[PDB]
């Protein structure tokens, strides 16, 4: 069914573009041909094998070819992109239990207990089962795994069953039509990815994708963005906040967007009003989700009426064929409007971390039949809306006090004069010491440091109590992203200690 809502377009659009790297393109119907190849030349090496498939690589088109071979031959795949580091895909290698690895670009990590397919070895397969069409039951189906992405180090199975549940509600939710070009910002080591894969496959979009140079050259990134004629913006909410920072980042640049689709961090009231002001036209969802609830689960139209209401901006309602479960600190269930441990429950929920047992056991659950897995993340339900508080480690107790890390992020933020910022907490060594905030000022006449931190504790003093105020303040012009465009934490604790 996936499969074939997907083949469809090969049919009826074959020269539509599915997916574009910088000059490199594959139109739907080139991509089910060479991805019918591979699936083709992987059952003839694999006859009765069904072990997960290594795709290694960026951004090349073939990444995607070899996602669909894969899963044509009854494979999931790993998706591994080139920043995991050398040791993290060794250990993947190990435990997923992986045969084979297929990449389009040069395997740099040192020798991997795994058969490597690369480059023109890649190509010859192409070449040499061009034509050939693998046997439509080998197909993964049901409840076999689809892919299998890493998180932490532990692999999340995902599903036939959880992708399409995911798809369906995605394409209806976030009322995405057909041919549209969506932005593919996320590598696809990450499940943020998913979002604009899938639904532009089975939708016959186009994926326009974005990578780790562009970002690091903002000047070609947004050269590319120009051209790119998106319509559907899916990306961590720090990546869209980069890419506010240029003024030119509006519906000049690129007046056919029609969506913005968000997961993955907090997304502030403030950037979603920035974004209504450059693209007047456009719709913002809000969405939550751990990778292992196949990407997201809950979502919400951002309108004016949100965000007026809203300070902090719910991450929304649950897709209805899953359900919410909020755990007060003990087994027992919290009553609504209190805070707790988010749990999800239904279809969403992976069957678990691959040959980890004891880690599976400690994360995820049986409720009444089905699975359910406990995130780790603190928040509450109100009606059926659900609120991110913050992560449950993420909870620094300051002299006698607790405080979700985020809700002071989230008041810094809110301050005149902080465009960006961030809370680093310093510890003694085992308690936590102070706090750090890191910010990135907006405009404002002050002639010296002290006077816009000043400002900003002066204002910070009505919003919090003086304890969970930060002690010490550093600017900067931006907060450094991780590869899968979330804020790096580590990076600025790495820093602001040294």
Known sequence: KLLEQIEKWAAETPDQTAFVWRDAKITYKQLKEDSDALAHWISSEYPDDRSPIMVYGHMQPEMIINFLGCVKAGHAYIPVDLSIPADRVQRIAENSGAKLLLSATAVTVTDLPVRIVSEDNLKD??????????NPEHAVKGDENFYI????????????????????????????????????????????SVMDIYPSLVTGGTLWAIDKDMIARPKDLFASLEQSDIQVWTSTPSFAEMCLMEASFSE?????????????????????????????????????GPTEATVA???????????????????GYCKSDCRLLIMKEDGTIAPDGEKGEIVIVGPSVSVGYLGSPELTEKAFTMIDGERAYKTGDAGYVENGLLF?????????????????????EHHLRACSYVEGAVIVPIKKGEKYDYLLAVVVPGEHSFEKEFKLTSAIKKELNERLPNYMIPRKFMYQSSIPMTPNGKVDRKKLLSEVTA
Not at 163 to 183: C, H, R
């Open 297 to 315: 689960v809950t979502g919400i139209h951002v309108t004016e009426e949100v965000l007026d209401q809203y300070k902090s901006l719910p991450v």
């Open 149 to 192: 992405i890493y998180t932490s180090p532990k692999g999340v199975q995902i599903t036939y069953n959880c992708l399409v549940s995911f798809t369906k509600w995605a394409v209806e939710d976030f009322n995405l039509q057909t041919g549209q070009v969506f932005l593919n910002q996320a590598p696809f080591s990450f499940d943020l």
């Open 388 to 408: 991110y508080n913050g992560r449950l480690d993420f909870q620094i107790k300051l002299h006698g006090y607790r405080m979700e890390l985020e809700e002071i």
């Open 125 to 134: 397969i192409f070449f040499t089962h061009k034509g050939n069409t693998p």
């Open 252 to 288: 000049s640049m690129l007046p056919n967007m029609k969506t913005f689709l968000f997961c993955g961090e907090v997304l502030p009231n403030e950037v979603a009003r920035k974004l209504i002001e450059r693209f007047p036209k456009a719709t913002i969802m809000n969405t939550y």
